[PDB]
């Protein structure tokens, strides 16, 4: 049908950057001046200007300036239902979902309030630099529905669910094991593959599910093996206490799990922070994949996960950064890379021997710098990979789909631009480019995001 | 010379909000439609708008509408010189210092170059909500010289001073103790009481100060009692561990200061982070205070601030707020107190027993937990307690100066608006007033600075 190419500074990986200590250039691609070439939503062609535009006679470039072009952020930890309270006051996990999480996702049970707030959602996503997101959802059905559904309109890939809730909830939001496999499945049916939406078997966690309901995760799993599995995992202290108790015949939270034959590839615990060097080395295994959320874990007081654990060479652990709003206060994975960054330099202190030598460790410590390359590959390539679907997005390149983001590098507080400066202006190598996206990580926030592509169509614009 | 008075909502501090646990309101001051009457810079009458208006025949109204209106932000710690170079990569506190900041400070020896960052670094300020600062220079009179000129120009409330550094620094950098004393007599005679200007003594830090400079800082602020004494104290392990040695005749870090009568009265130490709970009741008795720098802390890894020692009422210890440019990323104390909840919310959780119940403390865990009335308190009223100003700023009382900021909170995000509807719009109530502006901070960042006044006088205002 058609066939458009977009011109302009570029910037991807091709491989993993902690693959390469002290020479993490070799994992990212840079084309000062390149030109990439979608069909129908659809990359085919990438590589410097003139030897593309060579081999494509008469496409219609449009020429993004000024700017420097990456791969659309992937956050693999989105709450639909919690759009409108991402601040709540004074609680860590437990009493906060009580408290402020609850009495607003039972409102999304109205098919209009949902409808409102999935368009909201969505919204916030492109205007932040989020093309693609594992979204959890609430207990009914219609959330669900019309999230999927508005994806479609924008044709964005997504992964969702029907997020169940057996225990520890207000019986009017909780909801029957049976209906949940009832839904799930007939959700399963009418979304699951169709077009970019992706489903996941969601059992919101084991703290608020009965092995009933978890039982039933692994039935729809069964029936369904191309289905994602969607969860939470060690994220807060008493949240791991209670889940023991709740679950008296398991040794760890993830063993929990294990117990349902969930773990494996297409499985996603949100938020390690309290996982064992065991439990990190059997998801390595199993191919499981652990979401990190920073800002989460700071807002609700979890901790600090640990990145430099699960970046373990010996047992390397598949991840994907998230933002998990609600729990996290910000929309951007810019903004999540800044907490990201902050919570590997706490780390980085702790395992240098600096106040305790027996813990020290200097190979992990590290892991723990979240450098331009480490950081922005966690939330494109990275993340592309934890969430297997790396074979359709992660870069650009050619077969995969075309979902972008044009940041100014410029964008932020007041000081950004004086201290960019100090790379005159656009970057010319690899290095600059890399040195100007931390402090878009760092100095700036969703404001250095200037223009949000979705499958060759440009969906969003900042005024 | 001129009178006008200022209409719309305003919001402020009479009291300490950790003085009245459960019953914070009491320490606010809240008024829907409020009047502040200022002649030449300087508040004569506030309270509500008939009783006020009526009081004042014809006096020019200027009213704001829309907007939250609360004194000037108090930033007792930022590093003039460092205002470009915000989000240096890889380092914690020390060799940080060495790649990324000296050579960068060392620019401000030229007066061209120093004469700019003051400008910027001063627009920076007020573009994000901060009217008055206590700030860090470089070792060259230069740059203390270009920012008492310039925040004369705009006639800003604001401390500083020649920052003299001995070892541990390059050579072209550091200079000598006799120089320092010369240089800094000579300053205070120029700048300190003239205007809003007022000066500090300024040791960078112990392990940078041989026992000659703290010397010299001694006979300065003996010889000029009235004038302020700016420092950093406890901020990394690594730090802490080199002053120990640098100063083998001490015991603890507060130790070195007090060893040259630095501590007391007007005396303020940045990031407490590994301070012992001797040092913070020594503090708490001789009147001396400390600057909580949570972005900074986070960035380089320092650590968690311990928040609820630090406001033990049983030795209460006096702060102010940091945003520490350089060390932080954030010019703006609504990004500060963004940070300053994330950590206060991490040591919840360490004090609550749910990991280990020998250290819990459910008082100290309650006291981390930064409200809307804690937090605003703390970059207003607290932060100006905190650095003895509190005569001249802290809130609209009349007599004080009149410095404000008119506070949009549908500012940032996407998402904010939809958030802060829960409450349809302007807050009718000192608690509904309170609950916007938690979203202010958390939700929000100085895209919620809509305007900035200085003396009376509206020096920004958002494009
Ligand atoms: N992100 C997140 N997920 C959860 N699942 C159950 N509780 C929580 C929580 O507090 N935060
Ligand atoms: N804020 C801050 N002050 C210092 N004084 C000496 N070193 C440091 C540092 O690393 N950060
Ligand atoms: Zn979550
Ligand atoms: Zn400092």
């Given at each position: ?20 200590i ?9 084309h ?111 959330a ?39 839904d ?16 996941a ?26 289905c ?72 609700l ?62 190979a ?7 450098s331009?390359?480490?950081?922005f ?23 995969k ?9 410029n ?24 040195s100007?996206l ?26």
């Amino acid at each position: 049908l058609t066939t458009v190419g977009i011109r302009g500074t570029f910037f991807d990986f091709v491989d993993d950057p902690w693959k390469h200590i002290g020479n993490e250039q070799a994992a990212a691609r840079f084309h000062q001046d390149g030109l990439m070439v979608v069909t129908d939503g659809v990359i085919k062609a990438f590589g410097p200007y003139e030897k593309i535009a060579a081999a494509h006679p008469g496409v219609e470039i449009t020429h993004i300036k000024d700017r420097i072009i990456v791969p659309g952020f992937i956050d693999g930890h989105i709450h639909l239902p919690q759009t409108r309270v991402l601040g709540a006051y004074g609680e860590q996990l437990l009493p906060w979902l009580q408290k402020s999480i609850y009495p607003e996702e039972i409102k999304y049970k109205d098919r209009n309030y949902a409808r409102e707030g999935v368009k909201r959602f969505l919204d916030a996503l492109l205007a932040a630099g989020t093309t693609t997101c594992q979204a959890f959802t609430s207990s009914s059905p219609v959330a669900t529905e019309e999230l999927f559904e508005e994806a479609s309109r924008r044709n964005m890939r997504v992964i969702a669910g029907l997020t169940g809730i057996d225990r520890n909830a207000p019986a009017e939001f909780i909801d029957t094991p049976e209906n949940f496999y009832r839904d799930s499945k007939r959700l399963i049916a009418q979304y699951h593959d169709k077009g970019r939406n992706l489903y996941a078997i969601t059992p919101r966690f084991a703290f608020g599910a009965s092995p009933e309901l978890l039982k039933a995760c692994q039935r729809l799993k069964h029936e369904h093996p191309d289905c994602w599995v969607n969860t939470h995992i060690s994220e807060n202290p008493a949240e791991c206490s209670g889940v023991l108790v709740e679950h008296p015949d398991c040794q760890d939270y993830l063993g929990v799990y294990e117990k349902f034959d969930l773990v494996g590839p297409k499985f996603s615990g949100g938020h390690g922070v309290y996982l064992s060097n065991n439990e990190f080395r059997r998801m390595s295994k199993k191919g499981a994949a652990v979401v990190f959320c920073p800002c989460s874990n700071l807002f609700l007081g979890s901790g600090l996960f640990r990145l430099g654990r699960a970046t373990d060479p010996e047992h390397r652990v598949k991840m994907s950064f998230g933002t998990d709003v609600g729990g996290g206060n910000r929309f951007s994975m810019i903004s999540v890379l800044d907490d990201a960054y902050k919570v590997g330099m706490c780390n980085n202190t702790l395992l240098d021997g600096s106040i305790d030598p027996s813990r020290k460790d200097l190979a992990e410590a590290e892991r723990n710098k979240l450098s331009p390359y480490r950081g922005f590959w966690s939330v494109t390539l990275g993340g592309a990979e934890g969430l297997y679907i790396d074979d359709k997005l992660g870069n650009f390149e050619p077969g995969k789909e075309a979902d972008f983001v044009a940041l100014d590098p410029n964008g932020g507080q007041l000081a950004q631009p004086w201290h960019q400066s100090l790379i005159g202006a656009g970057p010319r190598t690899v290095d600059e480019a890399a040195s100007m996206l931390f402090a878009v990580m760092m100095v700036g926030d969703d404001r250095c995001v200037d223009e949000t592509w979705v499958m060759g169509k440009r969906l969003y614009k900042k005024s």
